[PDB]
Amino acid sequence: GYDEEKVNRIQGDLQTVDISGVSQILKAIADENRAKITYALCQDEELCVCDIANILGVTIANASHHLRTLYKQGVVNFRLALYSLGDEHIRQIMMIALAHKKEVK
Amino acid sequence: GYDEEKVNRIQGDLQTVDISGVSQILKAIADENRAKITYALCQDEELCVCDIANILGVTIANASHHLRTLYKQGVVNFRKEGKLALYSLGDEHIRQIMMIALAHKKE
Ligand SMILES: [Zn+2]
Ligand SMILES: [Zn+2]
Incomplete structure (x- = not known):
């Protein structure tokens, strides 16, 4: 094979962490609207679902759905x-x- | 309306921030293979495309394609x-x- 000791060791490293869970949590935050929610809650302590739907310009059902998803993670x-x-x-x-996104080059 | 002042202000704070860009980069890392590449690059300073492919168990072409994406973001x-x-x-x-x-995930 190729670099099998280093490779087997990094596979081992990956097997011991919940990389799956990282993907779920990042995917939840990565959604355009959920990212807006998350940023909104970094600025005000608490918001109700109606504030969030109006901020996002989405239906109350849609905001509820987005909050459910964030909540599960x-x-x-x-x-x-x-x-x-x-x-x-x-x-x-x-x-x-x-x-990170403000950096140049 | 409803809470128009608070909504206006927060919309205002959001407009000043690159949330679109934050989404793009988090999406790039979130992909299950690209998250594994990212974690793997936390374990060595540098890895070649061949190491990455063998660690994921993917082809060198598929590894290249994830790395291009990560690179672009x-x-x-x-x-x-x-x-x-x-x-x-x-x-x-x-x-x-x-x-x-x-x-966070383990708490
Ligand atoms: Zn940076
Ligand atoms: Zn936490």
């Missing part, structure tokens, strides 16, 4: 239901991707 | 040497995104 929490960021890890991923 | 960089093309994480932002995403 811990991206948002709820406490009328008011939504907030799941935790500080979500805030940091947002701010880091935004910083 | 600024997730990976590369240099040529031998010649042989060597790919690395863009910078620490990508490592942080990967590691923070992993941390």
Whole structure:
């Protein structure tokens, strides 16, 4: 084969982490509208579903659907239901991707 | 309307930020194979396309195609040497995104 020891070791490294779960969580945030929601909750502490539907310019059903999806991945929490960021890890991923996207070259 | 002032303001904050671009880069990393490439590049400074293909268990052509995508979205960089093309994480932002995403999912 080719570089089998290094390759087998990195496959091992991948097998020991939930790369699948990373893909799910990033996919949830990556949706245009869910990314807007996530950014919106980085700025205001809590929003209700109607605020979110109006901000996004989408139906209340669509916003509910988007919040359900974020909720399943811990991206948002709820406490009328008011939504907030799941935790500080979500805030940091947002701010880091935004910083990275401003770089030149 | 409903909460027009708050909605207006937040729409205003959102307009100042490149959310479209954030979506593009997160989508690039989220793909199941491209997430594995990204994590794999957290384990060595540089890997060649052949290592990446063998780690994923994909063809060298399919590996190339993921790497092109990652490259275009600024997730990976590369240099040529031998010649042989060597790919690395863009910078620490990508490592942080990967590691923070992993941390969140296990909590
Ligand atoms: Zn960066
Ligand atoms: Zn977390």
